[PDB]
Every structure is written in C-alpha cells, then in structure tokens.
Structure 1
C-alpha cells in the first residue's frame, strides 16, 4: 500500500485482527507496521493554499 504522509504514534486502539484505519473518503487513516506490530497514525503532509 503506497502513500505519502507523516508517520506518528497512534493513540487510537486497534483490536488484534484490525490492521488498517479508515478515513471518510477511501484513504487509510492509520496503518500497523508489518515487521513490528505497533499502530501508526497517517497524516497528509502539510499543504496550505497560497
């Protein structure tokens, strides 16, 4: 799964079966790392209209 975003520690709890967080419009809010099982929040990199 390919995406561009900042990776941060994820406060939201995930049950063991659960692997991917869901956003409103078909994008992945959070991901659990495959190698080590910790939830990571995904935030899109800062963009501001100029």
Structure 2
C-alpha cells in the first residue's frame, strides 16, 4: 500500500487499516486504553 497526508474538517474517503468509509474527521476528546484500537456505537458502527 501507499500513504497520504491527513485532512480534517472536509468530507472525504478514508481507508484506515482496511476499514473503508466516507465522512468527516474531527479531533476527539475520548480516552482509550493501550489494548484498544477503535470504538463503536449502539449499531456496531465505528465512531472513533
């Protein structure tokens, strides 16, 4: 694969480690743990 700079606050396509999606990315105030990679909402769709 290749790599590309990170853009924020614009609706874009993203491919994070095989996770494909379309949306806008924003800085987060959430706190994770060293054994976690991403979070989920009620409908088991990624949010962070």
Q: Which has the higher strand share?
A: 1
Number of residue-to-residue matches in the alignment: 30
In structure 1, stretches of 5+ residues that fail to align are: 31-50
TM-score, normalization: structure 1?
Answer: 0.54
Q: Which runs of at least 4 in structure 1 moved beyond 4 Å after TM superposition?
A: none
Normalising by structure 2, report the TM-score. 0.56
Q: Which runs of 5 or more residues in structure 2 are unaligned? A: 1-18
